[PDB]
């Protein structure tokens, strides 16, 4: 069915067409790679204007109907949960592998044979990363070097001013949900939030579940020493529904009757608190001015106007249970928390509910402030990188020096191993060595320097001048050898950078045909 | 004004047969490069925009559906081959179109089509008798247990892959998965699951049905994971507190009424929770998620609840336990409840996986993939479906022949020497039928990136020396013996491949005219 107007192409023409569509994505993000990369303007479907250089945001907002281009977007989705740093570098590296593969197609090399050469050369580069690597935290637990390293990468984002404060927050958060001895960190347990107003230095780390809600009365105790948590869907007062009120008066007899329920239910629901023994009361709808009276003398804290989905978030961290009806009240369903405090930010009153365990819990959420929404949104993805870096630093202590020193050192090892491979895949190993040179070359172009002139000198320094690897200076600092500049990226991020790039190149070369029905 | 056609388009004679031969080569061209384990993939988009990547020829032909009359003939024969067997549809398509290409220049010379049909009937009968003579039955041969012979045949399709280092461990996983099944063997029985992360050798094989178990909700430190004879409940019901399926919305002006509203809201849910407890079901699974409130009632009544199970895993479980999937809770009874021998909740993969071990009606199992990425498991998955069928067919049919075009070369030599002995027009047609079998060993060389000329010239010259079992190696480029390399295929399957190819080739030749009634 629908055979007419069906796209039909094959041979070398279909492969070159797929490479051309893939190089369009790589050439787009090649200019935004690195801290000096040019920003990309984004016009939202609703008319909004956002400008950011984040690679994970670019591929998400770009909508391309071409099939091969859609596969490149699916790659960055899995990388955000693994690397989160070289997401742009992989697309640039993937486009460099296909660009060099176009030259090999004219020589008559079969695509599957080309895909074999990349997989064979990839294992040489991965093995070379372990030899030139270095550790940091090996055989010790220290938070001092973990703050300094993660602070360097955050300096390129909008958090540049508060950059020192953001590094300390991510250290205590990851150590809280995960111990450094097991070296197993769960990123799902670490959440992130934000609110407009204030500055970036107002970001506070809280161990527990946290939402923005205030107390039913301002004079309630600001800190709760005992642990009693009553989580209900209804306030303590004459009963009310969970959705809408819609008060409609009928006659005067019904109005005078409600006043009888007032005095009756005001004292009855508060004495139920002292009967059960609860202290902090969490309910969907807030309390009126009459209910706050009796809660003042007994020093009973409460939270008013709790959202619907925020009820389940408190019961998970505190261990409490939801009590939809008043007949289900009991002591075993009460929650547990170390201390519940109210922290106000500045003169303006946010009055946020803070629930802490007074210890290291399994749930933490970072709440970021700021003066502009576009700065906070960029501050979210910037900290998300630091959460992933520290995650990889704890899981693997071994690291390598970034700034292009890793990609250049691998280009020398692969080029030497090419002469040891007597077969047609030798040419694929040579093109793989030149494709790794694009990442350090793109950093020199974005910094306003000659891409080729700077690249050729660095390759000679890693051989003639000294055996250890040297990097390229993007920020125009004092000199080379980024080890002194303290520019370091994780080792796992390097292994998954060239691996996820090689996998997609092999996937594209194996598809010689695309079939879609036409409209007739 | 007055004509016989009046919109009827019909052509007869030589141009009608020539037009059909060119149409059959279009069908073979699509599945041409998909032959062989290393063959390239294809991408087929539907009308809704869904991408499909598969190297299987039978799956591609189902998505094409060409409207050409002669093209529908080869597609129907290919579907009949996939239903009876499930492999060889590409081999049938290539041989059927190659038979027409060799006889194409002879038709333009004036040769009558009926004589060509006489050759395809005679040469096919000689090929069937020749295979049965050369076939060798290998079962207890060399005093080796079948477990080891099936292991070497398992790593054959797994050789020189990404798992080629750990393939020694995966070779036993394919053997163990087949041996757990009863005398009834089928590919869709054994399931395969993918779990990202972990080493390759960490892949686990479970005799029961396993699922990812996305359910994170309440009921921890309860719901014991070890039972003896639990009643397996299958329900599509959604037991969540706040949900669109079970809820109540009533608004009034009387505060006293809201007391009964919030109570009747939970009482409606309790009636569905008590009905499950009334039926005596121990293990209670559901496709839709289940809230925290329903888990507390099950913990107080000592009942196991695991939600968010895919429906496909439920149907594989339904056939395993022998129960049934019931949407409504009111129809839940002992008729739809299943049973199992041993139930256990393991730590495998870092995430809890539930599985039913020892179900009386279970013919199925589940194998879990562990790799560094999806491409590691996806490339391995396609190799496992073929590895299971290799173990499956070797037990069913003991008499086997070598693959990789080895049997195609021996038939080409015997029919070529016999064609010289028959005087007539049959000499040129049988000789063309021998060269038509060369497409099978040739496509394996081109799809592997090798040189088809150097291999076929060296391979054909080797069969002249008398070697019967030599064939093309898809890994190393050279001629090699596929019998000592343990590349085997059932003899009866290959015989039906030639019969289905010749029968489909005679249908196109037997049609000299196409009549289309205008509508």
Curated annotation (Swiss-Prot), chain A:
ATP binds at residues 34, 87-88, 403. It catalyses: ATP + H2O = ADP + phosphate + H(+). InterPro entries: Chap_CCT_epsi, Chaperone_TCP-1, Chaperonin_TCP-1_CS, Cpn60/GroEL/TCP-1, GroEL-like_apical_dom_sf, GROEL-like_equatorial_sf, TCP-1-like_intermed_sf, TCP-1_chaperonin. Its EC number is 3.6.1.-. Mg(2+) binds at residue 85. GO terms for cellular component: cell body; centrosome; chaperonin-containing T-complex; cytosol; extracellular exosome; microtubule. Ubiquitinated by the DCX(DCAF12) complex specifically recognizes the diglutamate (Glu-Glu) at the C-terminus, leading to its degradation. This is T-complex protein 1 subunit epsilon. It comes from Homo sapiens. The gene is CCT5.
Curated annotation (Swiss-Prot), chain B:
GO terms for biological process: binding of sperm to zona pellucida; chaperone mediated protein folding independent of cofactor; chaperone-mediated protein folding; positive regulation of protein localization to Cajal body; positive regulation of telomerase RNA localization to Cajal body; positive regulation of telomere maintenance via telomerase; protein folding; protein stabilization. It comes from the Eukaryota. ADP binds at residues 36, 88-91, 159-160, 404, 489, 494. It is found in: Cytoplasm. ATP binds at residues 36, 88, 91, 393, 404, 494. It catalyses: ATP + H2O = ADP + phosphate + H(+). GO terms for molecular function: ATP binding; ATP hydrolysis activity; ATP-dependent protein folding chaperone; identical protein binding; protein folding chaperone; unfolded protein binding. Keywords: Acetylation, ATP-binding, Chaperone, Cytoplasm, Hydrolase, Isopeptide bond, Methylation, Nucleotide-binding, Ubl conjugation. Its EC number is 3.6.1.-. The modification N6-acetyllysine is found at residues 62, 245, 315. InterPro entries: Chap_CCT_eta, Chaperone_TCP-1, Chaperonin_TCP-1_CS, Cpn60/GroEL/TCP-1, GroEL-like_apical_dom_sf, GROEL-like_equatorial_sf, TCP-1-like_intermed_sf, TCP-1_chaperonin. There is a cross-link at residue 425 (Glycyl lysine isopeptide (Lys-Gly) (interchain with G-Cter in SUMO2)). GO terms for cellular component: cell body; chaperonin-containing T-complex; cytoplasm; cytosol; extracellular exosome; microtubule. Mg(2+) binds at residue 87. PROSITE patterns: TCP1_1 (PS00750), TCP1_2 (PS00751), TCP1_3 (PS00995). It is linked to De novo genetic variants in nearly every subunit of the TRiC complex, including CCT7, have been found in individuals with a broad spectrum of brain malformations, and clinical phenotypes ranging from mild to severe epilepsy, developmental delay, intellectual disability, ataxia, and other features of cerebral malfunction. NCBIfam families: chap_CCT_eta, thermosome_alpha, thermosome_beta. Belongs to the TCP-1 chaperonin family. Component of the chaperonin-containing T-complex (TRiC), a molecular chaperone complex that assists the folding of actin, tubulin and other proteins upon ATP hydrolysis. The TRiC complex mediates the folding of WRAP53/TCAB1, thereby regulating telomere maintenance. This is T-complex protein 1 subunit eta. It comes from Homo sapiens.
């Amino acid at each position: 069915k629908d055979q007419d107007r069906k796209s039909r192409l094959m041979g070398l023409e279909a492969l070159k067409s797929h490479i051309m569509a893939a190089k369009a994505v790589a050439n787009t993000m090649r200019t935004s790679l690195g801290p000096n990369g040019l920003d990309k303007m984004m016009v939202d479907k609703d008319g909004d204007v956002t400008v950011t250089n984040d690679g994970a945001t670019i591929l998400s907002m770009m909508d391309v109907d071409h099939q091969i281009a859609k596969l490149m977007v699916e790659l960055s989705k899995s990388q955000d949960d693994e690397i989160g740093d070289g997401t742009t570098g992989v697309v640039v590296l993937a486009g460099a592998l296909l660009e060099e593969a176009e030259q090999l197609l004219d020589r008559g090399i079969h695509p599957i044979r080309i895909a074999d050469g990349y997989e064979q050369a990839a294992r040489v580069a991965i093995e070379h990363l372990d030899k030139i690597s270095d550790s940091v935290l090996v055989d010790i637990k220290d938070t001092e070097p973990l703050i300094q390293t993660a602070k360097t990468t955050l300096g390129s984002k909008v958090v540049n001013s508060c950059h020192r404060q953001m590094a300390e927050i991510a250290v205590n958060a990851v150590l809280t949900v995960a111990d450094m001895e097991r070296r197993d960190v769960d990123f799902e347990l670490i959440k992130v939030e934000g609110k407009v107003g204030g500055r970036l230095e107002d970001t506070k780390l809280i161990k527990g579940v946290i939402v923005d809600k205030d107390f039913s009365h301002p004079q309630m105790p600001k800190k709760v020493e005992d642990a009693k948590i009553a989580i209900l869907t209804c306030p303590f007062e004459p009963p009310k529904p969970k959705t809408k009120h819609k008060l409609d008066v009928t006659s005067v007899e019904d109005y005078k009757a409600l006043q009888k329920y007032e005095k009756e239910k005001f004292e009855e629901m508060i004495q139920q608190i002292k009967e059960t023994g609860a202290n902090l009361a969490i309910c969907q709808w807030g309390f009126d001015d009459e209910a706050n009276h009796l809660l003042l003398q007994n020093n009973l804290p409460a939270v008013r106007w709790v959202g619907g989905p925020e009820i389940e978030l408190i019961a998970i961290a505190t261990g409490g249970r939801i009590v939809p009806r008043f007949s289900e009240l009991t002591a075993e369903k009460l929650g547990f928390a170390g201390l519940v405090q109210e922290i106000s930010f500045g003169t303006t009153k946010d009055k946020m509910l803070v629930i802490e365990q007074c210890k290291n819990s399994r749930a933490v959420t970072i709440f970021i402030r700021g003066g502009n929404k576009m700065i906070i949104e960029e501050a979210k993805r910037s900290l998300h990188d630091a959460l992933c870096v520290i995650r990889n630093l704890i899981r693997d202590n071994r690291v390598v020096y970034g700034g292009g020193a890793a990609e250049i050192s691998c280009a020398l090892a692969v080029s030497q191993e090419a002469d040891k491979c007597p077969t047609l895949e030798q040419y694929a190993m040579r093109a793989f060595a030149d494709a790794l040179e694009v990442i350090p070359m793109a950093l020199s172009e974005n910094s306003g320097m000659n891409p080729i002139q700077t690249m050729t000198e660095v390759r000679a320094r890693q051989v003639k001048e000294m055996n250890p690897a040297l990097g390229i200076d993007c920020l125009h600092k004092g000199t080379n050898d980024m080890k002194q500049q303290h520019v370091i990226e994780t080792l796992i991020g390097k292994k998954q950078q060239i691996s996820l790039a090689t996998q997609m190149v092999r996937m594209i070369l194996k598809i010689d045909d695309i079939r879609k029905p036409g409209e007739s | 004004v007055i004509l016989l056609k009046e919109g009827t388009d019909s052509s007869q004679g030589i141009p009608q047969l020539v037009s059909n031969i060119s149409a059959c080569q279009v069908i073979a061209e699509a599945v041409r490069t998909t032959l062989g384990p290393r063959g390239m993939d294809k991408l087929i988009v539907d009308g809704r925009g869904k991408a499909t990547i598969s190297n299987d020829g039978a799956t591609i032909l189902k998505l094409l559906d060409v409207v050409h009359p002669a093209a529908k003939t080869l597609v129907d024969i290919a579907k009949s081959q996939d239903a009876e067997v499930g492999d060889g549809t590409t081999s049938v398509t290539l041989l059927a179109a190659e038979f027409l290409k060799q006889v194409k220049p002879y038709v333009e010379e004036g040769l009558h089509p009926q004589i060509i049909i006489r050759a395809f009937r005679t040469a096919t009968q000689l090929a069937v008798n020749k295979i049965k003579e050369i076939a060798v039955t290998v079962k207890k041969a060399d005093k080796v247990e079948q477990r080891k012979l099936l292991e070497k045949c398992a790593m054959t399709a797994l050789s020189s892959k990404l798992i080629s280092q750990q393939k020694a461990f995966f070779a036993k996983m394919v053997v163990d998965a087949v041996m757990m099944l009863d005398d009834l063997l089928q590919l869709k029985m054994i399931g395969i699951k993918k779990v990202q992360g972990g080493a390759l050798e960490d892949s686990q094989l479970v005799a029961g049905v396993a699922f990812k178990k996305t359910f994170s909700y309440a009921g921890f430190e309860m719901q014991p994971k070890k039972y003896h004879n639990p009643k397996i409940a299958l329900l599509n019901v959604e037991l969540e507190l706040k949900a669109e399926k079970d809820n109540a919305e009533i608004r009034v002006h009387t505060v006293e009424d809201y007391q009964a509203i919030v109570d009747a809201e939970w009482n409606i849910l309790y009636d569905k929770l008590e009905k499950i407890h009334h039926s005596g079901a121990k293990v209670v699974s559901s496709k839709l998620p289940i809230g925290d409130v329903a888990t507390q009632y099950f913990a107080d009544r000592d009942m196991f609840c695991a939600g968010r199970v895919p429906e496909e895993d439920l149907k594989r479980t339904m056939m395993a336990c022998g129960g049934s999937i019931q949407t409504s809770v009111n129809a839940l009874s002992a008729d739809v409840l299943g049973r199992c021998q041993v139930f256990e909740e393991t730590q495998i993969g870092g995430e809890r996986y539930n599985f039913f071990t020892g179900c009386p009606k279970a013919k199925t199992c589940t194998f879990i993939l562990r790799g560094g990425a999806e491409q590691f498991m996806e490339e391995t998955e396609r190799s496992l479906h073929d590895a299971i069928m290799i173990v499956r067919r070797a037990i069913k049919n003991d008499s086997v022949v070598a693959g990789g075009g080895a049997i195609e070369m021996e038939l080409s030599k015997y029919l070529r020497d016999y064609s010289r002995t028959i005087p007539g027009k049959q000499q040129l047609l049988i000789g063309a039928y021998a060269k038509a079998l060369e497409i099978i060993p040739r496509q394996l060389c081109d799809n592997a990136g090798f040189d088809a000329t150097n291999i076929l010239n060296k391979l054909r010259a080797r069969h002249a020396q008398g070697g019967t079992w030599y064939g093309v190696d898809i890994n190393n480029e050279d001629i090699a013996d596929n019998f000592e390399a343990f590349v085997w295929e059932p003899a009866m399957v290959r015989i039906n491949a030639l019969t289905a190819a010749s029968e489909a080739a005679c249908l196109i030749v037997s049609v000299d005219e196409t009549i289309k009634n205008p509508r």
